[PDB]
Amino acid sequence: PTKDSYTLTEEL
Amino acid sequence: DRKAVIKNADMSEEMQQDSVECATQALEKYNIEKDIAAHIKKEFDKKYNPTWHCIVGRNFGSYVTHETKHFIYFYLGQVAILLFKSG
Ligand SMILES: [Cl-]
Predict the structure, then answer these.
(1) How many angstroms away from the CA of A12 is the closest CA of chain B?
(2) Which of B2, B50, B56, B82 shows its CA 20 to 30 Å from the CA of B42?
(3) Residue B68 C-alpha to ligand 1 middle, in angstroms?
(4) Rg of chain B in Å (alpha carbons)
């Protein structure tokens, strides 16, 4: 059973 | 002295600490991002069965599909680490 996810790094 | 900050996790609390530990040993051993990522990927394929994927760096966004309970995205110091199982 799967699921979709985002990630983003902190702004630099 | 790298501070662990978990930003988003769909993963049991034990594995989250295990993930942070294995990433800690990877940063202790390697300095290049792909090498850190390979260390975490291979150890998780072994300790938790295939198939894991790992991305290490300071500037990136992602969109991935992952088995439930097998996703973590955390900072170890200034380095960001995305670890997850798909397949
Ligand atoms: Cl994020």
Answers:
(1) 8
(2) B2
(3) 17
(4) 12
